[PDB]
Amino acid sequence: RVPIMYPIGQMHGTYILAQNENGLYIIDQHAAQERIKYEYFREKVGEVEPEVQEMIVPLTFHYSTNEALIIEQHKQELESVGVFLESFGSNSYIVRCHPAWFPKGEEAELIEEIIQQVLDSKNIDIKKLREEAAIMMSCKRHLRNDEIKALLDDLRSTSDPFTCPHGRPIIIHHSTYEMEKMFK
Amino acid sequence: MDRVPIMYPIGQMHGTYILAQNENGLYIIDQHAAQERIKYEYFREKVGEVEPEVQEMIVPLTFHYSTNEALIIEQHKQELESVGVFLESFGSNSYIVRCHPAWFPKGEEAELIEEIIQQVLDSKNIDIKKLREEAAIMMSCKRHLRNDEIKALLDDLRSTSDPFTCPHGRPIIIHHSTYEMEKMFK
Ligand SMILES: [Zn+2]
Ligand SMILES: [Zn+2]
Ligand SMILES: [Zn+2]
Ligand SMILES: [Zn+2]
User: Fold this and answer.
1) I want to staple B13 with a disulfide (CB 3.0 to 4.6 A). Which of A19, A50, A59, A158 is the partner?
2) CATH code: domain of residue A68
3) What is the span of the domain harbouring residue A116?
4) Residue contact B10–A15, C-beta within 8 A
């Protein structure tokens, strides 16, 4: 957590500069937006029955006898993250629909990316898959002052305003104390 | 040394720090330390000048001393001369100050003149070079800035001999290069 951050400005269209009583905050815009998107998708994937949307271009996949074994093992886990596989023929599946909240235009690559995660873990439970899926979903010109403000406000009210879902810094903070030291 | 490239303002915080940037990255600036450096070189130039525009005072200043101080003060009457302190002796060990350089920090013209004098009285035996410096420093130390003010400050800091360090040895500028920032955010 962190108190209200007041915008100073932005630079190179990459970083936001802000301040409050605790000192100075340098904020990576992109990282901040991953974190904010994550808090959203992590909730969405936790829903038992999400609004569903029928695709326009349905997808097909095909797997080795072994990959299909793993996929049948993880039916419930895959469906719980929004991947609705229907097997037609041998080791082949169609995807006919998905949650309405999947990131538009990247459903195809998301579904295949999630399915690939399961094939790699070989044995994975729902909680871990939900985390992984939401991380994947989260990473699917200069900002206006109103845009900087919404961003600082949204970031502040997430679970971890300091670190992106991939574990990288969102915020470099120079405290009042640290700046006093820096300069004396 | 390498001359810092032009800096562009982002903003300020707490009436204490200036935020700036250019292609090279981010600059965090102690605005007071910056103002010191600027003013220091300005006054260090003036006090090194040969003939300054002098300004008479409405009410001259009076200074009384002992047989020691009046002794020292009368020895350095060319060193306090160039430093801007003009002591006219009328009685025994007694001086009046009619005038002083027009570029003397207003309001505290007297406060300063005494400090320059004090410095002399303290070091006891002190040469031109040291006094000259000490005087410049005293004049430079003698609210939230807008981006226009911030800009003017950045340009002036650039033109100095040492934009990174104040006359007291403390850092003026903390620089994060674009590469170093990318490293910090991995
Ligand atoms: Zn990303
Ligand atoms: Zn990330
Ligand atoms: Zn000062
Ligand atoms: Zn200083």
Assistant:
1) A19
2) 3.30.1370.100
3) 49-140
4) no
